Coordinates of N, CA, C and O in Angstrom, one line a residue:
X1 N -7.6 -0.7 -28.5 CA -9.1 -0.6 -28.1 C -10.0 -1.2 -29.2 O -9.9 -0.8 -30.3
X2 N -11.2 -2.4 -28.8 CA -11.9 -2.4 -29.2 C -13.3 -1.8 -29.8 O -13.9 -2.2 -30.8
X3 N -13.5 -0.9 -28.9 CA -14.5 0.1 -28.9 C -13.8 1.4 -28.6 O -13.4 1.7 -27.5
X4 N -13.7 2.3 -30.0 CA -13.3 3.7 -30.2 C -14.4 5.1 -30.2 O -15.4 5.2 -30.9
X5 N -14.2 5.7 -29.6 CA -15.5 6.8 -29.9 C -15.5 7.6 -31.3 O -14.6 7.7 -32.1
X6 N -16.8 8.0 -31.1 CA -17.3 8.5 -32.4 C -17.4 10.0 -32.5 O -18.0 10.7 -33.3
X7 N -16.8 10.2 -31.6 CA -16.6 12.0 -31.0 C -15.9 12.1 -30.1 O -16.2 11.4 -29.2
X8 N -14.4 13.3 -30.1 CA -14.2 13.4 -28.8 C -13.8 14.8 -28.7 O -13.0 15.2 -29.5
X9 N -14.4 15.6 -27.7 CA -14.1 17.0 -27.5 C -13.8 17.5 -26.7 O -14.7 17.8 -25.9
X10 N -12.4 17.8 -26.3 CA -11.0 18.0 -25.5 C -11.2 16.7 -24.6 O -11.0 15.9 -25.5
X11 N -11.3 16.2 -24.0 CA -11.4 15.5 -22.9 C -12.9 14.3 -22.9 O -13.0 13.2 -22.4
X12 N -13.6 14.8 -23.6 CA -15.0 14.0 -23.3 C -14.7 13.3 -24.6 O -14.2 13.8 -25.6
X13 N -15.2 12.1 -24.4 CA -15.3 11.0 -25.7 C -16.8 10.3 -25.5 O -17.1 9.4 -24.7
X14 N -17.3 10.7 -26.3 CA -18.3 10.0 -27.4 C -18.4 8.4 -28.2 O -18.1 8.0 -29.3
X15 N -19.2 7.7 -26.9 CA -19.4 6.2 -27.6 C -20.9 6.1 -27.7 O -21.7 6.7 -27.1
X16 N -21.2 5.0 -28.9 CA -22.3 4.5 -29.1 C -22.0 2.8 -28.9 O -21.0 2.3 -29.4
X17 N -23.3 1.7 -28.0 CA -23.0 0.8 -27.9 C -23.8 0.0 -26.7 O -24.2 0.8 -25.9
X18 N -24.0 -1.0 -26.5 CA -24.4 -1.4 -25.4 C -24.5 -0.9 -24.2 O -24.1 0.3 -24.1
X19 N -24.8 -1.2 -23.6 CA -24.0 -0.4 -21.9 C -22.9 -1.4 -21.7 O -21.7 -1.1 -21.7
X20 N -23.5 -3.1 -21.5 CA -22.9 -4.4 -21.1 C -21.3 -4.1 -21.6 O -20.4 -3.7 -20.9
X21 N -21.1 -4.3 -23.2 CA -20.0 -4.2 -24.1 C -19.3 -3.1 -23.5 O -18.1 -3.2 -23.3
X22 N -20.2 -1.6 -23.2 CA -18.9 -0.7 -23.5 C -18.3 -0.4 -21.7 O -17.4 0.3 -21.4
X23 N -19.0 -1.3 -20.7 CA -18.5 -1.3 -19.4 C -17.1 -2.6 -19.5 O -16.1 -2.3 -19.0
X24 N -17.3 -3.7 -20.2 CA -16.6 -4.5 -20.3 C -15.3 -4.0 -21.2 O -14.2 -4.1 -20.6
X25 N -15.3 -3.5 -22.1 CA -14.2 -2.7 -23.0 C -13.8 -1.3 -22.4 O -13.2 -0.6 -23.2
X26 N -14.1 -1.0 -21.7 CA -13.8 1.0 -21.4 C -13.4 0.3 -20.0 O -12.3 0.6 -19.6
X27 N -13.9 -0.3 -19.3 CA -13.7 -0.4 -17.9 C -13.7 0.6 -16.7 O -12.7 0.7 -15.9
X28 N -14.9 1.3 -16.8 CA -15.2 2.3 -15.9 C -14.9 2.3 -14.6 O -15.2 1.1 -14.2
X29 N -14.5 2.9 -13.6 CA -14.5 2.6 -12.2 C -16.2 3.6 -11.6 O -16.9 3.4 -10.6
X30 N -16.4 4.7 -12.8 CA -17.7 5.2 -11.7 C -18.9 4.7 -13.4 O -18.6 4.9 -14.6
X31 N -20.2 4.1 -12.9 CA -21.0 4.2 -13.9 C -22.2 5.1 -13.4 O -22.8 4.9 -12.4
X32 N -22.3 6.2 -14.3 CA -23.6 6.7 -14.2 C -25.1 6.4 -14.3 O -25.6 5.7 -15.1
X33 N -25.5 7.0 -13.4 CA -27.3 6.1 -13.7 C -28.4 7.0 -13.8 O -28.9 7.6 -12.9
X34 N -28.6 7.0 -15.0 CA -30.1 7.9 -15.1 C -30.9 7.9 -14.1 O -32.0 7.3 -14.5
X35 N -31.0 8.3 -12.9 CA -32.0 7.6 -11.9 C -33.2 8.3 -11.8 O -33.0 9.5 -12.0
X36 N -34.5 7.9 -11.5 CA -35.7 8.5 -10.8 C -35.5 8.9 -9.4 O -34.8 8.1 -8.7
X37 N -36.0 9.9 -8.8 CA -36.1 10.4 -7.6 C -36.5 8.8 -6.5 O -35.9 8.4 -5.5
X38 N -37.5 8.2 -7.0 CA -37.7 7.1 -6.0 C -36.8 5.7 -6.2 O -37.2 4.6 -5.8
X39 N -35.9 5.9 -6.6 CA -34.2 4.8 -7.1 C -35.5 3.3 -7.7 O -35.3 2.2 -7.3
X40 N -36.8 3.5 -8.7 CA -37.1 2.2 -9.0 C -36.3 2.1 -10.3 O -36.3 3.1 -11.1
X41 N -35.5 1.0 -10.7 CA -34.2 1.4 -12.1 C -35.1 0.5 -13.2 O -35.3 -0.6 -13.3
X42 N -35.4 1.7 -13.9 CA -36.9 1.1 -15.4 C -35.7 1.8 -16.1 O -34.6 2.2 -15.7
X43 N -36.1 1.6 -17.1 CA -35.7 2.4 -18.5 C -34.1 1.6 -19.4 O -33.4 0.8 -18.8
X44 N -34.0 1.7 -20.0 CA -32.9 1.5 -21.0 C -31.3 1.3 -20.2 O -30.5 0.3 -20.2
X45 N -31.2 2.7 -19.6 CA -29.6 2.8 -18.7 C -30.3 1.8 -17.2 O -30.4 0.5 -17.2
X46 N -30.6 2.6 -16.2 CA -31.1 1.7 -14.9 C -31.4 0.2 -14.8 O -30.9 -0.6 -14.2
X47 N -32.3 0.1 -15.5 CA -32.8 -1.5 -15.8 C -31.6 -2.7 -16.4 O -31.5 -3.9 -15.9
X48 N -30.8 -2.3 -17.2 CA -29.3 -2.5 -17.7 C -28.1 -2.4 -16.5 O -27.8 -3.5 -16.1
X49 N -27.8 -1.7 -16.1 CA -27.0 -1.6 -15.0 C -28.0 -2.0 -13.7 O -27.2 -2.4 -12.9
X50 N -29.0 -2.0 -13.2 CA -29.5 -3.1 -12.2 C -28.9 -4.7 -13.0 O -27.9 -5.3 -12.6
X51 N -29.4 -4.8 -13.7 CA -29.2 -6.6 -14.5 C -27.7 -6.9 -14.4 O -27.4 -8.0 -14.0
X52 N -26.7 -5.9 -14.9 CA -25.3 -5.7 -15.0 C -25.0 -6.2 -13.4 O -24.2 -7.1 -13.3
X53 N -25.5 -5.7 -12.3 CA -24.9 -5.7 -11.1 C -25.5 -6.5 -10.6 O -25.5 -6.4 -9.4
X54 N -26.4 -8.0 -11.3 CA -27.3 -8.9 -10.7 C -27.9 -8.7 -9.5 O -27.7 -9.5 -8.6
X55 N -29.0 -7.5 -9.6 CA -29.2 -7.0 -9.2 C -29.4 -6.3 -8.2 O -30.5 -5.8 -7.9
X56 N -27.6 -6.2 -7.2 CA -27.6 -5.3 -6.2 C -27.4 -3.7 -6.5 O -26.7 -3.0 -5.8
X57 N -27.9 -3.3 -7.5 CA -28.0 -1.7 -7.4 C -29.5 -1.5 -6.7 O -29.8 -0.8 -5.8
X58 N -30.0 -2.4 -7.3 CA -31.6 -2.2 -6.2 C -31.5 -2.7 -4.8 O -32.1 -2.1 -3.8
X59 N -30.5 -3.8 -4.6 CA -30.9 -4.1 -3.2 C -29.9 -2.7 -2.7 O -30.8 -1.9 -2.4
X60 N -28.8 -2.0 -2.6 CA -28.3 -0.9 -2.1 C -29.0 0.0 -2.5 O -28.9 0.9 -1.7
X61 N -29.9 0.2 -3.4 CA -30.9 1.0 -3.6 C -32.2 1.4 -2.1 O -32.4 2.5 -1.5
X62 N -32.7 0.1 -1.9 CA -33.5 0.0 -0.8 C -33.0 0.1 0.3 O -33.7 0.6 1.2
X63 N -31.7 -0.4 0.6 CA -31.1 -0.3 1.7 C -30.8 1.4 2.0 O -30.8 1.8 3.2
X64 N -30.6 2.1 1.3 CA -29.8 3.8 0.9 C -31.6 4.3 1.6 O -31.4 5.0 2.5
X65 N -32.9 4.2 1.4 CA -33.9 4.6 1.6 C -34.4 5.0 2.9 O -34.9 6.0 3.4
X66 N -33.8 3.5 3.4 CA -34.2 2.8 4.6 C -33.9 4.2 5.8 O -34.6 4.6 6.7
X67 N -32.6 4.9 5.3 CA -31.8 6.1 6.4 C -31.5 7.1 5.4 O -30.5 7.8 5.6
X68 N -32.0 7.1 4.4 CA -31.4 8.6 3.4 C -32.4 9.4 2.8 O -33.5 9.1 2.3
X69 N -31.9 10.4 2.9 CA -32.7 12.0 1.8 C -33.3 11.2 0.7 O -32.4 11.2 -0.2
X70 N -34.4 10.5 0.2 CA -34.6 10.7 -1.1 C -34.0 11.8 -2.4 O -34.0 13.0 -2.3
X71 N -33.8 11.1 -3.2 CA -32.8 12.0 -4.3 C -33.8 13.2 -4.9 O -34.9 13.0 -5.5
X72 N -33.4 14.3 -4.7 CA -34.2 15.2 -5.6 C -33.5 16.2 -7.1 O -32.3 16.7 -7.1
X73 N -34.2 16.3 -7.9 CA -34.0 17.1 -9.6 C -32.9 17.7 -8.8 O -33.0 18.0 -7.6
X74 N -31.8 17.7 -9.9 CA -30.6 18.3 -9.7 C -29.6 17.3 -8.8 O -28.5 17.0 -9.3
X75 N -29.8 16.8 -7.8 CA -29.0 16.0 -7.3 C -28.3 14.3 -7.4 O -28.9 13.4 -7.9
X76 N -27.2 14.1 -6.8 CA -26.2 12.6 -7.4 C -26.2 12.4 -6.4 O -25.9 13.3 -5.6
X77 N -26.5 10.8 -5.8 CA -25.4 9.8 -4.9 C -24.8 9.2 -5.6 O -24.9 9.0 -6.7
X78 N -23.9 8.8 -4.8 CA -22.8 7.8 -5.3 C -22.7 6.4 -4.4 O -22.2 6.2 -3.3
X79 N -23.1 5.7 -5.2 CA -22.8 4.0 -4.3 C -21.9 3.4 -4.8 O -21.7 2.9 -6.0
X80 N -21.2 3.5 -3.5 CA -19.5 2.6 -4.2 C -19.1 1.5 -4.0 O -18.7 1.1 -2.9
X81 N -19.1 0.8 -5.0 CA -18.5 -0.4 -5.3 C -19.6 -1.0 -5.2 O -19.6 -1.9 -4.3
X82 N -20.8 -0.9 -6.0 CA -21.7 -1.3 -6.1 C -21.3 -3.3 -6.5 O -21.5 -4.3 -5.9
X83 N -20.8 -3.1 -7.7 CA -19.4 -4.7 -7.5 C -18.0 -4.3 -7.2 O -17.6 -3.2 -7.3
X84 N -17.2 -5.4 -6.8 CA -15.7 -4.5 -7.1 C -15.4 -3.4 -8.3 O -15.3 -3.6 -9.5
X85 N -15.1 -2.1 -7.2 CA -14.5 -1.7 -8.9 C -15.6 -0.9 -9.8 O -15.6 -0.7 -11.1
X86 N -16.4 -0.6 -9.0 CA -17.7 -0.3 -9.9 C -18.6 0.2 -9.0 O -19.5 -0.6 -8.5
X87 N -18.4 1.6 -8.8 CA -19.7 2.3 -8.1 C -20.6 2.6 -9.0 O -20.2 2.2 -10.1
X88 N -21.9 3.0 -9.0 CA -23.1 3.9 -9.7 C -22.8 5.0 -8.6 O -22.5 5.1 -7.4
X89 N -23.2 5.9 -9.8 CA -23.6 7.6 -9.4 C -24.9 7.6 -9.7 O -25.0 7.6 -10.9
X90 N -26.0 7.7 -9.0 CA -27.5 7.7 -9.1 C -27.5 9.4 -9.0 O -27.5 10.1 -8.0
X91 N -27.4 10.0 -10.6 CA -28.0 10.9 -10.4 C -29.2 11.2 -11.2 O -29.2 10.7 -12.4
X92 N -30.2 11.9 -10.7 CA -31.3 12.3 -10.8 C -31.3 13.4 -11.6 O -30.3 14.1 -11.3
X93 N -32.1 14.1 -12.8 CA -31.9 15.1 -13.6 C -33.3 15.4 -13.7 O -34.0 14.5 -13.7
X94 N -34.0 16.9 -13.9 CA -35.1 17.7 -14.0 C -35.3 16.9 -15.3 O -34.5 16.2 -16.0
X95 N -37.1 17.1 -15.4 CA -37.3 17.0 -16.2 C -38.1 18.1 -17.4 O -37.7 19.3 -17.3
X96 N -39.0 17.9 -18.3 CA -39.0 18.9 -19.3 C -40.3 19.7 -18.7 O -41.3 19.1 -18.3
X97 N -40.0 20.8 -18.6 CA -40.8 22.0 -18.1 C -40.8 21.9 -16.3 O -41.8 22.4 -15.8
X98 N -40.0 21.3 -15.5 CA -39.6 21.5 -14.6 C -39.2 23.3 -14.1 O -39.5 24.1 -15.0
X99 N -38.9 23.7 -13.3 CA -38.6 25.1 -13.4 C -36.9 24.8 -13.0 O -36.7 23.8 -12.2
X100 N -35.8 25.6 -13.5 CA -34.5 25.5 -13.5 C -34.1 24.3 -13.7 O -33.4 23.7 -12.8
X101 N -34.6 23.8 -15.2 CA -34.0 22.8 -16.0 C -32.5 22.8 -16.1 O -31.8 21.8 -15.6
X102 N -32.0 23.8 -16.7 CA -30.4 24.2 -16.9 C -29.3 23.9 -15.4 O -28.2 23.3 -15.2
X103 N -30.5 24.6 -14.8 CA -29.3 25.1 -13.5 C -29.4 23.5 -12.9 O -28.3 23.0 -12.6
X104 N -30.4 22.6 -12.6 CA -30.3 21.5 -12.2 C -29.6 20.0 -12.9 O -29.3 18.9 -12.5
X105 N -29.7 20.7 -14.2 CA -29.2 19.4 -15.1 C -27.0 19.8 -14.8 O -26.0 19.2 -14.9
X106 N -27.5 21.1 -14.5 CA -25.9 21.4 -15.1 C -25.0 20.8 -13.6 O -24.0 20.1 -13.6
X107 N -26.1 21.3 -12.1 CA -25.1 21.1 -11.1 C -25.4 19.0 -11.0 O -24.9 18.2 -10.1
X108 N -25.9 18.8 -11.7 CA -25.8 17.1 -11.8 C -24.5 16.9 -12.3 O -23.5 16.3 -11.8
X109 N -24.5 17.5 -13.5 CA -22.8 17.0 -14.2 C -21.8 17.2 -13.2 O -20.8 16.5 -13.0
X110 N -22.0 18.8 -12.4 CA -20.9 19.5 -11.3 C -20.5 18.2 -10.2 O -19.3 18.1 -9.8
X111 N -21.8 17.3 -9.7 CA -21.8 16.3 -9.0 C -20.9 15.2 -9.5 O -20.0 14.6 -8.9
X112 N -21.3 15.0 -10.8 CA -20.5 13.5 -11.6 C -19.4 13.9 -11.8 O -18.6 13.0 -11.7
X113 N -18.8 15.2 -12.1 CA -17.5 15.3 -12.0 C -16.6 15.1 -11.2 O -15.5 14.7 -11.5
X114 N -17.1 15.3 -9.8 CA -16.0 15.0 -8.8 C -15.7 13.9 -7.9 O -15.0 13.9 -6.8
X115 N -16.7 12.9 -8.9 CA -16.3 11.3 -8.8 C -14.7 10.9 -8.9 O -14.0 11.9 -9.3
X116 N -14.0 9.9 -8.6 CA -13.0 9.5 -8.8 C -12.9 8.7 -9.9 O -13.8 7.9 -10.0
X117 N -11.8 8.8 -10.8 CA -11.4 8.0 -11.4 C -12.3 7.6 -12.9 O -13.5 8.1 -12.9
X118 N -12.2 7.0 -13.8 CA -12.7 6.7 -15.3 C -14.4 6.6 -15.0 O -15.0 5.6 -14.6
X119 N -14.9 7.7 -15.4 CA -16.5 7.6 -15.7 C -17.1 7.2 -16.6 O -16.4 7.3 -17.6
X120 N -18.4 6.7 -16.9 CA -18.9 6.6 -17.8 C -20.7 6.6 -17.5 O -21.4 5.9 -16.8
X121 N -20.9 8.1 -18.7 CA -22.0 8.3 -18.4 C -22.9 8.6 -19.6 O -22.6 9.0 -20.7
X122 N -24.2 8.3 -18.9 CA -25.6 8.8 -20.4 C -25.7 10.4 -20.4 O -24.9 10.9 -19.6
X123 N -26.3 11.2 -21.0 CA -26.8 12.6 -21.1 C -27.9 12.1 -20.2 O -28.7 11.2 -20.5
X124 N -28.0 13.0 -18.9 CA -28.9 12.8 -18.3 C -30.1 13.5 -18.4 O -30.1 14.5 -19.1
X125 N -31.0 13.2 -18.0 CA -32.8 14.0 -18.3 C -33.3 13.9 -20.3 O -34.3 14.3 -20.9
X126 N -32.2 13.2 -21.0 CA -32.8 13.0 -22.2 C -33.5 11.4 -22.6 O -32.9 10.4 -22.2
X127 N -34.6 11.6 -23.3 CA -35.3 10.5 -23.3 C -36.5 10.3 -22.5 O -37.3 11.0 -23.2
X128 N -37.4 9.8 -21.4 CA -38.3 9.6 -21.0 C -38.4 10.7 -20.0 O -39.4 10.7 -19.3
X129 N -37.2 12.0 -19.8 CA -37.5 13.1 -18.6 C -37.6 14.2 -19.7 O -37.7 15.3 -19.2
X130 N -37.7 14.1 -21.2 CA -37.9 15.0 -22.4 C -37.2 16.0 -22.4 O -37.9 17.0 -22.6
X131 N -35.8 16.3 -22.1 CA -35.0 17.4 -21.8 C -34.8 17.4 -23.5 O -35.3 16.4 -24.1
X132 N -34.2 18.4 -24.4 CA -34.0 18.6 -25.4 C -32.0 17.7 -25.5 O -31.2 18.2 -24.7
X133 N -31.5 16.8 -26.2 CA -30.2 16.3 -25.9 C -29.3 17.8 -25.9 O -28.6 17.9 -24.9
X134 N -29.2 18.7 -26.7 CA -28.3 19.4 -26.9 C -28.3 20.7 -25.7 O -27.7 21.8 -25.6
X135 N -29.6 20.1 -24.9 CA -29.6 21.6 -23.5 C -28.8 20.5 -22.7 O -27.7 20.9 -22.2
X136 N -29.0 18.9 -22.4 CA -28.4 18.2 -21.3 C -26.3 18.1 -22.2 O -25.3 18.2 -21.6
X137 N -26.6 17.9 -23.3 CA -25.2 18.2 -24.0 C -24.3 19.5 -23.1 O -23.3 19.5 -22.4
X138 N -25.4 20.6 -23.4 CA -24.7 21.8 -23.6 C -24.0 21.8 -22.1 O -22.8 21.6 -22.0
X139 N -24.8 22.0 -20.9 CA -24.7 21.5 -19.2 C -23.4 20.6 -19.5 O -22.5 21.4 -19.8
X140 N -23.1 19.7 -19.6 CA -22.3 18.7 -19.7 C -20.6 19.3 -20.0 O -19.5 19.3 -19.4
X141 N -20.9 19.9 -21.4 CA -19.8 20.3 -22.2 C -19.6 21.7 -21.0 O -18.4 21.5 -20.5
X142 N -20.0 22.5 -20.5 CA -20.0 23.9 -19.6 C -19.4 23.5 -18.4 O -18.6 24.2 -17.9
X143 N -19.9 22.3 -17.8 CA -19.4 22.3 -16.4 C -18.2 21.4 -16.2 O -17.2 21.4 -15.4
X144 N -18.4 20.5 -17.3 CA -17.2 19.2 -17.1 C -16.2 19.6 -18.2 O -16.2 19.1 -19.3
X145 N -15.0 20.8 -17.4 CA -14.3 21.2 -18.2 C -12.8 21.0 -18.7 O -12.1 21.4 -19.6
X146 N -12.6 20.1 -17.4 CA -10.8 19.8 -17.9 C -10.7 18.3 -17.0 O -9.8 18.0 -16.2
X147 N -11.9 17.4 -17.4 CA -11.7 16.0 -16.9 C -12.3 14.9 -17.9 O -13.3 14.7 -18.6
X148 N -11.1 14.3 -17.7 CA -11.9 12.8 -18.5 C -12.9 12.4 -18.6 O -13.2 12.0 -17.5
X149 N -13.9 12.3 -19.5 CA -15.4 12.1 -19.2 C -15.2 10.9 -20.4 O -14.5 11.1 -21.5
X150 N -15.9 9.7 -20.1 CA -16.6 9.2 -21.4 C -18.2 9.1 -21.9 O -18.8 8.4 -21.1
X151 N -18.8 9.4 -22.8 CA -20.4 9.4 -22.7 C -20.7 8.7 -23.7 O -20.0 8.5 -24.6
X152 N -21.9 8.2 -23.4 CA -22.6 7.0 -24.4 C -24.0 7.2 -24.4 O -24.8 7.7 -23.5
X153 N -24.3 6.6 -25.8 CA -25.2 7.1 -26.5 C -26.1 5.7 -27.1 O -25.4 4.8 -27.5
X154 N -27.3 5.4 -27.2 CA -27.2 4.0 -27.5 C -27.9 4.3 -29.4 O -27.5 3.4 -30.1
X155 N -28.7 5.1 -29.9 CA -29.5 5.1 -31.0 C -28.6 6.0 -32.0 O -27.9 6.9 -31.5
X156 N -28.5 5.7 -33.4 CA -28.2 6.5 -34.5 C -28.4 8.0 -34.4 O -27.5 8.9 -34.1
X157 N -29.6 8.1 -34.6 CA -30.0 9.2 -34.1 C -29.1 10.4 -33.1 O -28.5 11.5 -33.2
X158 N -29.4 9.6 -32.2 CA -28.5 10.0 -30.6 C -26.8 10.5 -31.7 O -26.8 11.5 -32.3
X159 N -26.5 10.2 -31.8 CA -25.0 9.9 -32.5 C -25.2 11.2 -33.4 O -24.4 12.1 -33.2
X160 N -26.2 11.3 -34.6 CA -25.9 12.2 -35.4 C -26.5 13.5 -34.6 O -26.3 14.5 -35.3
X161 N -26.7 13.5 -34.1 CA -27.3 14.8 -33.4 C -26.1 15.1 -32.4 O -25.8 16.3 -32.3
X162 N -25.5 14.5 -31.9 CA -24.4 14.6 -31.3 C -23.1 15.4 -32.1 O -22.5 16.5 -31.9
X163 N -22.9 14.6 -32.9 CA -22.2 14.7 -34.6 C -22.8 15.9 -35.2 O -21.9 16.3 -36.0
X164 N -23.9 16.8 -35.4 CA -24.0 17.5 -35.9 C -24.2 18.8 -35.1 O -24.2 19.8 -35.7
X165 N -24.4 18.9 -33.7 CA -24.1 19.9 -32.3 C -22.7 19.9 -32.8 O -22.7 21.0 -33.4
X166 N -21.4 19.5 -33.0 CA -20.0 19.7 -32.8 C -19.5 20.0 -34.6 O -18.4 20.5 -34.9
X167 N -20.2 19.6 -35.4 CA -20.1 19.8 -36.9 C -20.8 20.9 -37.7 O -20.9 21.2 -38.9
X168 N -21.3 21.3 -36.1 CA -22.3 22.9 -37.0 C -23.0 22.5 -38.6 O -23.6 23.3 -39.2

């Protein structure tokens, strides 16, 4: 392997890196997507994986609208094969002072888990939905308990706080 993680605890492995790079070296079959409730894909992860998938996660995005539940806090779809080989799990995560932050961030992970096959996902609701990383950590580490997970991280920062949650 090219790209080794920088944490791994029992099962979950800890990368820092691109998204582009670490989809091309890890070779995920499910990618996770930080999503907003109304699927428009802004931010760092969505806007990256829209670009990644030249941009049919938006067109399956609009088409998913056209006849579906809008996504609400706490809940995942899954669009599969968004390219060959490569679904997105558009899940949606509470944001900061939301009411049942925990319980909604936590049954998001319960959702990504029972994807098939090699995932690769962000800590969801941290960053622009102001969750604290080590409450969307904690959710993560509690529900996704005896499956392969890989998670990625893109800032230093992100990394030592990660690094120092598991190094006490």
């Amino acid at each position: 392997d090219l790209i080794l993680p920088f944490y791994k605890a029992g099962k979950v492995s800890f990368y820092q890196g691109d998204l582009d790079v670490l989809i091309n070296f890890l070779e995920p079959d499910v990618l996770v997507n930080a999503a907003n409730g109304d699927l428009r894909h802004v931010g760092g992860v969505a806007r990256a994986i829209d670009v990644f998938t030249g941009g049919k996660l938006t067109k399956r995005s609009k088409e998913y609208l056209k006849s579906s539940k809008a996504i609400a806090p706490g809940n995942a779809v899954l669009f599969e094969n968004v390219l060959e080989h490569l679904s997105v799990m558009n899940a949606v995560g509470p944001r900061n002072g939301d009411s049942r932050v925990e319980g909604k961030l936590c049954n998001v992970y319960k959702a990504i888990a029972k994807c098939d096959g090699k995932i690769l996902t962000p800590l969801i609701s941290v960053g622009i939905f102001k969750v604290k990383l080590e409450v969307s950590l904690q959710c993560l580490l509690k529900t996704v308990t005896d499956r392969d997970l890989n998670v990625f991280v893109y800032t230093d920062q992100e990394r030592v706080t990660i690094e120092n949650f598991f190094n006490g």
